[PDB]
Ligand binder design. Structure first.
Ligand SMILES: [Mg+2]
Lengths: 229, 249, 98
RNA sequence: AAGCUAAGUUGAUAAUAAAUAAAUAUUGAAUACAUAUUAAAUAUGAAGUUGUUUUAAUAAGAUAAUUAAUCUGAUAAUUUU
């Protein structure tokens, strides 16, 4: 009771309702902005739900499967725009994480909101598909977009990529096919260029992307450690 | 090759005399003190579990003290430092965590960058151990008694009811809005103030505690642990110090 | 006029003697204790959550004490509960008799 | 379940020693005796004193480092002992 989770200045039931709601919204929209604390707890729930889904998908035991399904049902409000959410979890959301061991959600710190000074954050699903057909882009993963923007900026400036940026890119790649990733980047890039003032040469851009990918993929003091004399 | 120096007659003719023994001298104080003969070792409180005496079949609550990488770094003497003591280190620590100065110090004494350094004060020069030498749990015998030092769990800001076991007030018989309060905190005008050391709410715990005469139950070099009978102060992973006891030597 | 030529010496850093995983110790100790206590996991088998024919609330049981250790009489009781704990050796059971 | 808790567990009630209070003495004049000394010398003597033990503060001293590709700190992030 004391120190197992956040309390969030709400009594039990209400808190539970809030958290379930947040999870549902995250599943719906892929990315949401809220207070930091709320995000932090919401992620815990969401991750657990995802894992349950995964287990249901995998495990042979019928009994286990049923139980997991029940748990999933319990942990959601399947009513309005969440009516088909159960289906979505199994069919669309859970598969993306089949190989990934935990860390399905990403919390990113924003600026504290001006009126209230409450510290804010983005909570979002990790590998969310950025390109929906009959739509162009999707309301996807902010981090990826940010990375792409940074890359573009670097290119514009003709500076080398920051090591941090490279690390981030590598992380993104780890659970991602190369070609797919490249495609995603390309999709992002055009859109970004359109948004910004910058021009767009297709082939050149492609080449740049390829170069970026290559470095990412194929991997490559005053104190002297010495034995006790 | 002389220098221009003078000298007063008052100071030249002053007969030599030795200053007598001051009680507030370090040397004198040393003599007074009731110190252990041997040294001790630094340990980490890991947890608690039950020891079973196999003959009598009796259950003793025992706390496990882990003696990882304990090593004498250097010692202090009456001539230089005014007391006899050995600085013992415990446990390895990563370069990144250690100050350059401290690294240098460690190098000076051919040890690895330690996790916790502590002096153990001893009686006489005999008690000192050669520096750079390792200590094991085998330094203590099962059955012997030790004195343990560690830092108690912090209770944060505590009321007088919890700190000093004040009785508080009655629960329901008129009593209003003061159920756990300390009551009067002084007398009227004829002190006209609150006396120093009045028991009052405030921080409790996270303080040093010496617990005396604890029995060493077991000592296993293969596991790097000592077993002590009873409860030792502080949380899991707190640094503890054990010396051989003075009351039951 | 000699300028002071500073020289920041490269400080050596020696490795530790012993090699202990402090995070494992407790478990190891527990294991050792259990080995000491019940050779061949006999007492452990009953009370095992993986054994089907274990002890359950509802079982009536006769506890037989060793005569060499103590001089206690043997006790018969209906098990109300088996108390399983974080570590193994301190498990117990609570049984009654009218 | 953890945690917190006592009705639970564990431990302590700090020695050894120094000088003493009331008191108890030795020798021994001043005062041919007597007198433990409100004389010179020499002794016993208390849960009291000094001290010890315990905690907090202070920081003499000691070890090391020296304008720095990872010197010592702070700001910042994830946190709980
Ligand atoms: Mg007691």
């Amino acid at each position: 009771t004391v120190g197992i989770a956040r309390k969030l200045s709400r009594d039990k039931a209400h808190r539970d309702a809030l958290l379930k709601n947040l999870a549902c919204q995250l599943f719906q929209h892929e990315s949401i902005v809220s207070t930091h604390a709320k995000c932090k707890e919401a992620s815990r729930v969401a991750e657990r739900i995802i894992t349950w889904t995964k287990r249901a998908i995998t495990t042979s035991n019928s009994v286990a499967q049923a139980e997991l399904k029940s748990q999933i049902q319990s942990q959601l409000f399947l009513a309005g725009d969440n009516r088909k959410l159960m289906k979505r979890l199994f069919s669309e959301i859970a598969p993306r994480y089949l190989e990934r061991p935990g860390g399905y959600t990403r919390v990113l710190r924003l600026e504290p909101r001006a009126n209230d000074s409450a510290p804010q954050s983005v909570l979002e699903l990790v590998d969310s598909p950025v390109m929906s057909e009959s739509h162009t882009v999707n309301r996807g993963n902010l981090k990826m977009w940010l990375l792409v923007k940074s890359v573009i900026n670097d290119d514009a400036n003709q500076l080398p990529h920051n090591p941090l940026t490279l690390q981030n890119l590598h992380k993104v790649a780890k659970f991602k096919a190369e070609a797919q990733l490249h495609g995603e980047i390309m999709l992002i890039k055009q859109v970004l260029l359109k948004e910004m003032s910058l021009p767009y040469d297709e082939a050149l851009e492609n080449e740049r992307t390829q170069a970026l990918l290559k470095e990412v993929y194929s991997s490559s003091s005053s104190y002297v450690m010495v034995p006790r004399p | 090759s002389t220098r221009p120096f003078l000298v007063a007659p008052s100071i030249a003719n002053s007969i030599t005399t030795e200053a007598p023994a001051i009680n507030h001298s370090p040397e004198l104080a040393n003599a007074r003190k009731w110190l252990p003969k041997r040294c001790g070792l630094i340990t980490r409180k890991k947890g608690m579990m039950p020891y079973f005496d196999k003959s009598t079949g009796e259950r003793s609550a025992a706390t496990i003290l882990e003696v990882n990488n304990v090593e004498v770094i250097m010692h202090r003497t009456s001539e230089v430092n005014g007391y006899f003591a050995c600085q013992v280190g415990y446990g390895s620590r990563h370069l990144s965590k250690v100050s350059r100065q401290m690294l240098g110090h460690f190098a000076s004494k051919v040890v690895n960058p330690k996790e916790h350094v502590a002096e153990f004060r001893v009686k006489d020069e005999k008690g000192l151990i050669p520096p750079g030498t390792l200590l094991k749990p085998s330094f203590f015998k099962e059955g012997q008694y030790v004195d343990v030092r560690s830092v108690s769990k912090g209770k944060g800001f505590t009321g007088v009811m919890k700190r000093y076991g004040f009785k508080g007030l009655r629960a329901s018989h008129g009593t209003s809005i003061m159920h756990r309060h300390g009551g009067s905190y002084g007398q009227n005008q004829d002190p006209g103030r609150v006396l120093p050391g009045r028991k009052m709410p405030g921080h409790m715990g996270n303080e040093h505690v010496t617990i005396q005469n604890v029995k060493v139950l077991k000592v296993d070099d293969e596991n790097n642990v000592i077993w002590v009978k009873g409860s030792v102060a502080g949380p899991k992973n707190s640094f503890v110090k054990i010396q051989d006891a003075i009351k039951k030597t | 006029y000699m300028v002071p030529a500073t020289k920041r010496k490269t400080i050596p850093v020696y490795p530790p003697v012993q090699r202990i995983a402090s995070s494992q110790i407790m478990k190891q100790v527990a294991l050792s204790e259990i080995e000491s206590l019940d050779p061949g996991a006999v007492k452990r088998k009953l009370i095992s959550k993986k054994n089907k024919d274990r002890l359950k609330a509802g079982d009536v049981v006769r506890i037989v004490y060793d005569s060499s250790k103590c001089s206690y009489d043997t006790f018969v009781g209906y098990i109300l509960s088996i108390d399983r704990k974080q570590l193994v050796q301190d498990a117990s059971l609570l049984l009654r008799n009218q």
